[PDB]
Amino acid sequence: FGQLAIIFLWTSGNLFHVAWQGNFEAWVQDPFHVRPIAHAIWDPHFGQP
41 binds ligand CLA (CB under 6 A): yes
| Nearest approach, Cβ of residue 1 and ligand CLA (Å) | 20
Phi, psi of 9 (to 5 degrees): -75, -15
> Alpha helix (H) ranges present in the chain?
5-16
Q: Which does 1 bind (CB under 5 to 8 A by kind): another protein, ligand CLA, none?
A: none
Ranges of beta strands (E only) in 1-49 are none
Q: Of the two residues 25 and 43, which places its CB atom closer to ligand CLA in the complex?
A: 43
- CA dist 36 and 49 (Å) reads 21
Chain positions contacting ligand CLA, by CB under 6 A? 41-43, 45
